[PDB]
Amino acid sequence: KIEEGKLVIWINGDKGYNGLAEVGKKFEKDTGIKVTVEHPDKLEEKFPQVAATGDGPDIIFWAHDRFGGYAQSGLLAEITPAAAFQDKLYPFTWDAVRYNGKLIAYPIAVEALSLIYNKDLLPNPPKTWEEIPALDKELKAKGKSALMFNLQEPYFTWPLIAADGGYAFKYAAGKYDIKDVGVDNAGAKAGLTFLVDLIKNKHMNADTDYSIAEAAFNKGETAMTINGPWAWSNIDTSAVNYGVTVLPTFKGQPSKPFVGVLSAGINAASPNKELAKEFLENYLLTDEGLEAVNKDKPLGAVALKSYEEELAKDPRIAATMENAQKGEIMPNIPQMSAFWYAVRTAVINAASGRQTVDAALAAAQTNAAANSVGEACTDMKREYDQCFNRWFAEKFLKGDSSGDPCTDLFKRYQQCVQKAI
Ligand SMILES: OC[C@H]1O[C@H](O[C@H]2[C@H](O)[C@@H](O)[C@@H](O)O[C@@H]2CO)[C@H](O)[C@@H](O)[C@@H]1O
């Protein structure tokens, strides 16, 4: 299980994990407390599995959308920064990591997708998605192409899908409507249909992934890609001369990327919660800690005000913020995981031709809604069970029963299930 007196951090392999390891070395030099940074594959799915057994990292980095799920399953410690420390970060970043009235992580940086373009191939990038076919056709005649980006992660296509009206979950009055997923409407279909038509008219390849799109852009073969701040670093070392700009408009509407707050949460099973708090508040979330990470791979717009004021001079960051403001902060509810799985499949199926746009999205809507409501019914069940298991062991089995207290909890659960059907 987790080791006492040591910090183990998990963070995604596309981030500045070597720079974070330098912050960890500084912590060790000051305190003698070893910090180890790992980037396991699919860490966002591995974390819940290992943490549920009380193993895993002391600190986990991911975008904020996954944290509500982790918190709801009891996998994260509550965090309680002093007022003085909170005021060092932008208030909207705290909002992203608030779940059920509690803070469940520290906000690190704001990530949004932008359009990245090769200035030598394309000194004026297109303002609209509708121009892309004609641009591509021209470029293919010269043995180049217009645009390549990662089709295998729905994060990258969502901005298009959402531009004319696709959504995830309704929000109103402090509550997400989990019965209703917005992935099957006219705007969602128009967006995805545009994408599939790019593929059908040979302007993109259906199995373009992160690495193929990254190699194609940084080797000068394609004129544009869609990516986050983390990717700028590899383009810097390539021979490509790039700019970063607002995503193209669709049906005259802004693309709407789903905006992530890269966040650090503390494993509820960690024996090192105080050391983790010290590391995060006094080493990572400082101008020099963020600089060391940023130097490795750009973080984006950082949550820390003092450092963001220096980063705001970078036009790449201004573009990141332009796109962020046109997009939307992701929800952090546990259902988000089901939303993404379902959109991932729909995109891949429609892009590869395994399903039509209309059947792919209809099926995503159905499966996301079912699992989302299912996760609520499961939470109602778990609450019944906690009440019953408590009552049965401490009351019934001790011969001190005069009725089952946990009947209304069951009926609420029963109603959830029977309504879902
Ligand atoms: O593709 C769905 C995926 O989107 C987001 O993951 C992003 C992440 O926020 C970024 O930091 C970056 O690393 O790329 C990921 C996409 O590959 C969501 O945060 C994630 O929950 C979801 O599965």
Author numbering: 1 to 421
Published text:
The Mdm35 homologue in mammals is TRIAP1 (TP53-regulated inhibitor of apoptosis 1; alias p53CSV, p53-inducible cell-survival factor). Although it was originally identified outside mitochondria after activation by p53 during mild genotoxic stress 16, later experiments established an evolutionary conserved function in complex with PRELID1 for PA transfer across the intermembrane space of mitochondria 8. TRIAP1 thus contributes to the maintenance of cardiolipin (CL) levels in the inner mitochondrial membrane of human cells, thereby sequestering cytochrome c and stalling apoptosis. Crystal structures of free TRIAP1 and the TRIAP1-SLMO1 complex reveal how PRELI-like domains could be stabilised during mitochondrial import and the location of a buried phospholipid-binding site.
TRIAP1 possesses a twin CX9C motif that is predicted to form two disulphide bonds within the oxidising environment of mitochondrial IMS 17. To examine the folded state of TRIAP1, we crystallised it as a fusion protein with maltose-binding protein (MBP) and using the coordinates of MBP to provide initial phases, we solved its high-resolution structure. The structure reveals the characteristic α-helical hairpin motif that is stapled together by two disulphide bonds located at C8-C47 and C18-C37 (Fig1A). Electron density was not observed for the C-terminal 18 amino acid residues suggesting a degree of conformation heterogeneity or flexibility in this region. Oxidation of the twin CX9C motifs in TRIAP1, and its subsequent folding, is also believed to be promoted by Mia40, which produces an identical arrangement of the two helices (Fig1C). A striking difference in the structure of TRIAP1 is the prominence of an exposed hydrophobic stripe running the full length of the CX9C coiled coil domain (Fig1D). This solvent-exposed hydrophobic surface is dominated by a series of stacked aromatic side chains conserved in all TRIAP1 homologues (Fig1E), suggesting that this represents part of the interaction surface for the recruitment of PRELI-like proteins. Remarkably, this extensive hydrophobic surface does not induce specific multimerisation of TRIAP1 when free in solution, as NMR line widths (Fig1B) and gel filtration chromatography profiles are consistent with a monomeric species under the conditions used in this study. It is conceivable that the concaved shape of the surface frustrates the association of monomers, but provides a complementary assembly surface for induced folding of PRELI-like domains, which remain unstructured in the absence of its chaperone and then are rapidly degraded by mitochondrial proteases.
